[PDB]
Amino acid sequence: RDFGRKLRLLSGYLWPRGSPALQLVVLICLGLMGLERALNVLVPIFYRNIVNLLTEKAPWNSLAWTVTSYVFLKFLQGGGTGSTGFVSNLRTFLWIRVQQFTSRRVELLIFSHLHELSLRWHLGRRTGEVLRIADRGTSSVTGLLSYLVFNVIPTLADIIIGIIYFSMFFNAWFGLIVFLCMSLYLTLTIVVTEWRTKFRRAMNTQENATRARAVDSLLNFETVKYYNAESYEVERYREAIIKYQGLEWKSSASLVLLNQTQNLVIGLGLLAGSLLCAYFVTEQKLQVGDYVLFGTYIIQLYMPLNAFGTYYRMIQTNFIDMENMFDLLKEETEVKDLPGAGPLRFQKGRIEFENVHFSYADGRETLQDVSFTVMPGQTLALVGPSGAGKSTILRLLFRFYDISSGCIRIDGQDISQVTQASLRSHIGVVPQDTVLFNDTIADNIRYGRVTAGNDEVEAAAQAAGIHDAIMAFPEGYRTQVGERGLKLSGGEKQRVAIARTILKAPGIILLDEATSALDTSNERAIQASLAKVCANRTTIVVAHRLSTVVNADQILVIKDGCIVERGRHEALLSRGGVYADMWQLQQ
Amino acid sequence: RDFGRKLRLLSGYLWPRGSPALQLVVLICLGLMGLERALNVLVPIFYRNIVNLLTEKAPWNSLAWTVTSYVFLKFLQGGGTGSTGFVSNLRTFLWIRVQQFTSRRVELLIFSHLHELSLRWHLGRRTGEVLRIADRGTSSVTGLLSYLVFNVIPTLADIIIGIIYFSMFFNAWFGLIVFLCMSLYLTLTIVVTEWRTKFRRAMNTQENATRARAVDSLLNFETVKYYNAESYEVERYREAIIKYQGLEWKSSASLVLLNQTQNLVIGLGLLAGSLLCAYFVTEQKLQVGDYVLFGTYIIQLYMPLNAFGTYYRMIQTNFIDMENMFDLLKEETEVKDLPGAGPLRFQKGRIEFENVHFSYADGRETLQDVSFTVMPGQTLALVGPSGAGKSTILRLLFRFYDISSGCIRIDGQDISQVTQASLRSHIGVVPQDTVLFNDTIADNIRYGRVTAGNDEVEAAAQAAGIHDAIMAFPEGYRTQVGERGLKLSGGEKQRVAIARTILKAPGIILLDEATSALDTSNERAIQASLAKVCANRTTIVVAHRLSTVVNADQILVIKDGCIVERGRHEALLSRGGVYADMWQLQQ
Ligand SMILES: Nc1ncnc2c1ncn2[C@@H]1O[C@H](COP(=O)(O)OP(=O)(O)O)[C@@H](O)[C@H]1O
Ligand SMILES: Nc1ncnc2c1ncn2[C@@H]1O[C@H](COP(=O)(O)OP(=O)(O)O)[C@@H](O)[C@H]1O
Ligand code: VO4
Ligand code: VO4
Ligand SMILES: [Mg+2]
Ligand SMILES: [Mg+2]
């Protein structure tokens, strides 16, 4: 069953592996834990000893030596109540190393997973939820591991010794009944604990949303301030707390009732034997004062079984709380690299389609019967009314989603066979919407080729028509862009983005509605420079202002998921089709 | 004594305020704690008497009655160490209600103080810091309110009893000596810890930036997948762990040294006491065994002081964490209402500028001597090369920032006097870059006037032009736009907002940049339908695509922080000014 798989994987990250130095530190700590109880029991023996020594009034040397030994061992024991003693503390301080290892490995695991799911799962997420799961997750493991070694192993070993012992002290068969009693006690408390899982699960899956209403709301500050707000949002946030309030108060209370009902049954189970002894005593059939054995008997079962019960609840809570993470760690990727493939041989660069169809949700065909080819060194442009499907034709060629029928070829090879890691090398895009890392421009613009020196980056942004404005800034390049990169400007953000790709100097360039959001003037230059410095030719560019693709080699028009009519500029203008109407309306 | 001020705010929310029902639950819990201690001490006396009276002979139902009473007394006892008794659990379960109250009244506080800071602080934040610093704060308060009810108060009360008691048992002046000795002990243990506190702030600050790498990276998938990564992002993420990891190492060890070394003082003190006792016993005056009396006296000084000390370090840690939290509350709004402000009177919406000067950080002038007036019912259009500062002029009229000289008047009235709460109600704005809440279209487009019903919103979006394309979607008005609304489309993401403002129906409108994404055709229709709404309402529109403002009422050109030339389209073109150059190059 499932429990199997979970545990197995869990086998590794629980027990330190591969680093023998941290392999050993668990054992020393375990052994010191073992030594602690023995020392605690041993100390009173020497206390009694010194007592008698005192009694006889022995010479000062022997009594002083015994005093020194006693104080030595009392210091090493630590003194009971708070275990605030040497041998006890050394455990914690030598534990603070192995815990850090297993806390690092879990967290730096799932993070390396969130950057490999396909783009669809990214768009569909809700940032609050995914941000929270990691927080509750890692705490679960770092709690389980620091809880399994201190308590469960010692108690279990002690009780198994207790059952192995006393077998010869009583009859030979006495061990079997004790083992069966322990097993039967265990199996009874299992069925009763299913009263908990439903409420904990409800808590948890309702807590995630009440995080989403926070981080989602705070994320877009400008929208909540433009329209009048700040009294709708606080109110709505409160009304999501009360639900979580009520749903907790059931789960927390349901623990205490289960705790008391566990205790009471054991208490009256022992009271039955006590009343049996009372019946035997008082001259009913005997006056035996055998309470010496019975009084010892109640503790030796009251401690271990209640202790064993009150921990199994803790472990059950920890797994049911963990349960949510496993999912974000098993949702497999989508687009997949066909096992066994290599780099995509690269030549001057020729891309072609043939008979591609693609649908987002099977409700309707987003793209039907697309077919177009481009020769190296030429420029191909798309123009269409909003939503017709300009963005998707470009977004497929970079292989986020996956084709349905037909095929896409780069320079004579399919893209399905070639590994996807290489395909990202030669293709550079500038996105429809730009985002920036919250860091200074100098670090942000070099991000394409980390090796690049501090002169070439200056050379690149100069060709992008942005350099002359930046130097006039106060503080120079050390200026900070600010969160999500809107503090900088309204348009210069686009120019920074367009410099990013120029730095990388890829093979093929896929500008997308890039020239917009600028001004009619600077555009001419960006284009001109981009041209001279066009890197490797083969460029596809989707733009709306027709005054920027007038001289492109080939032009396409997309009405709805299908090519309408194609040609060059002057030749297609006289045709008098829809493109003619767009141009005429664009005065 | 800033500590003086800080405390109040603590006293405000710790002890329940204003709610007598949750006022009472503190006293019941405290009293139950006390009676728990009383039961724990009382039971053995009961047990000893029952054993003695049962021991001899001859019970007549008295043994049974006493045994049953004993069993229930044990049931209420809880058996000491485990606290698994009907008294101990009642404490926790009646503690759940009051704690949750404090946990709420803190978290909902700062969330309503985090939507009132002005815009500049927001553009300067790091989402990691602000999202984390709340989580630590809302844990510190509920943690601190645990100790000052369960642990510290009982121990302090016990010390007060122990010092008032034994005053008749010994000389009266003894209590003064004991009090002075305890104060002297406390005086040293403060100085030893304060060395530690300058060594936790480094940990806590260093954690913030590490959180900054996570959320800020995960906040933009596109820019980390378009180029190649996961061989740089993970690698850099590890580094911001190792630094943190080592810093925690160097901290949490300092607790162990400064917890053991305190013990060694007490151990040496007890060694000195025992050695003096032995020297006195060894026939110095007599073989009197005074050690039995002395040891109990010594343990009296031992435990009510070691316990007092070891509950002084947790308090210090808790105030370090709250110390990092308070700073977010002390910050003040950059702009604040002038006290005693009357709501604005709105007649026709004429707006007037008078010699405004404004800069962001005193490095350079951003706007110089702007002067323009528009009468009601007209259209003003700004056109100029990027970075000149049209966006700032638009952002200023809404009172986000504040002016430096001169004033701006709305309907012949200053805006320095009127409270900002009224001003934002009349004005409608569609932003430069759109954002969306992660919820269905029906929720985002409705957000303008929550009262408005399902009919008016449907009628409204028709004027926008989005209506036809929506129903072609599967699921209609209940589709999901996903996080930050980049799943919808490229163009429609603006048409939604341009419907939102129409729904609010303000007095005056400030379209920042409508026709950037929308294509050419859908434009003409949106412009025509927008005019049909009402010719009376005044609008400010700033558009790079120069076609859309051909026939506006009057036009301004901004070169750099200053007006250049003003006039209507037909007359100004013949002037042959810079506007002529822009238009001619555009054609
Ligand atoms: N992730 C998605 N989820 C739902 N619908 C989508 C998604 N991506 C694209 N679409 C649909 O496909 C169309 C894509 O058109 P697109 O080429 O983006 O238009 P534009 O060129 O204006 O950006 C949109 O109209 C949208 O309805
Ligand atoms: N929040 C800010 N902090 C500092 N400087 C800013 C801020 N916002 C804008 N600026 C500077 O002031 C100018 C504002 O120009 P803006 O009106 O945004 O130009 P555009 O309209 O072309 O986007 C920009 O050049 C930018 O350098
Ligand atoms: O706000 V702009 O950079 O499009 O003038
Ligand atoms: O909405 V667009 O057709 O400019 O990608
Ligand atoms: Mg702007
Ligand atoms: Mg698009």
For residues B87-117, one letter each, b for 16 or more C-beta atoms within 10 angstroms of the residue's C-beta and e for the rest, the string is bbbbbbbebeebbbbbbbebbebbbbebbeb
- Give yes or no on whether A97-328 and A351-433+506-585 have one common fold: no
Superfamily of domain B171-310: ABC transporter type 1, transmembrane domain (1.20.1560.10)
Contact between chains at A93 and B256 (C-beta distance less than 8 A): yes
Contacts of A519 in chain B (CB under 8 A): 384-386, 544
Q: Fill in the DSSP letter of residue B337.
A: P
* B80 interfacial to chain A (CB closer than 8 Å): no
Among A236, A226, A125, CA closest to B480: A125
Which value in Å is the resolution of this experimental model? Answer: 3.9
Ligand 4 pocket (Cβ < 6 Å) reads A 386, 390-391, 432, 513, 544; B 490-491, 517
The residue count of chain A comes to 587
Report chain B residues whose CB lies below 8 A from the CB of A586: 520, 547
Chain B residues closer than 8 Å to A424 by CB:
227-228
**Owner of token pair 């006693």:** A70
Contact B402, A193 (CB under 8 A): no
Phi and psi dihedrals of A44, rounded to 5?
-60, -25
Q: In angstroms, rounded to a whole number, what is the distance separating the alpha carbons of residues A240 and A236? A: 6
Would you say A442 and A471 are in contact if contact means Cβ atoms under 8 Å apart? no
CATH node for A351-433+506-585: 3.40.50.300
B119, B358, B392, B432: residue to mutate for ligand 2 pocket, most atoms within 8 A of CB: B392
The answer, for A221 touching chain B at a CB cutoff of 8 Å, is yes
A556-582 burial code (b ≥16 CB/10 A, e <16): bbbeebebeeebebeebeeeeebbeeb
Rounded distance between C-alpha atoms, residue B158 and residue B169, angstroms? 17
Q: Does B44 touch chain A (CB under 8 A)?
A: no
Nearest residue by C-alpha to atom 26 in ligand 2: A489
Q: What's domain A97-328's superfamily in CATH? A: ABC transporter type 1, transmembrane domain (1.20.1560.10)
DSSP string, A461-503: HHHTT-HHHHHTSTTGGG-B--GGG-SS-SSHHHHHHHHHHHH
The beta-strand segments (E) located in B316-360 are 351-358
- Output the furthest CA–CA distance in chain A (Å, rounded): 127
d(Cα B454, Cα B477) in Å, to the nearest integer? 11
Q: Which two tokens stand for residue A32?
A: 């010191």
What is the helix, strand, coil percentage profile of chain A, to 5?
A: 60, 10, 30
DSSP string, B502-549: HHH--SEEEES--TTTS-HHHHHHHHHHHHHH-SSS-EEEE-SSGGGG
Contact B356, B550 (CB under 8 A): no
Host H or E run for residue A188: helix A174-192
Residue A569 host element (H or E): helix A569-573
Ligand 3 atom nearest the C-alpha of B432 is 1
Q: Which residues contact B163 (CB under 8 A, 6 or more apart)?
A: B175, B178, B179
* Beta-carbon count within 10 A of A529 CB: 15
In a mutational test of the A interface, the residue from B256, B279, B520 whose CB has the highest number of chain A CBs within 10 Å is: B520
* DSSP code per residue over B406-440: EEEEESS-BTTTS-HHHHHHHEEEE-SS----SS-
Per-domain boundaries in chain A? 97-328, 351-433+506-585
Asked if residues A438 and A482 have their Cβ atoms less than 8 Å apart, the reply is: yes
Ligand nearest to the CA of B495: 4
Q: Residue B384, annotated ligand binder?
A: yes
Fill in the amino acid letter for B273: G
Approach to solving: cryo-EM
Q: Are B314 and B195 in contact (CB under 8 A)?
A: no
Interface membership of B393 toward A (CB under 8 Å)? no
CATH superfamily of domain region B351-435+507-586: P-loop containing nucleotide triphosphate hydrolases (3.40.50.300)
Torsion, Cα of A372, A375, A377, A382 (10° steps): -10
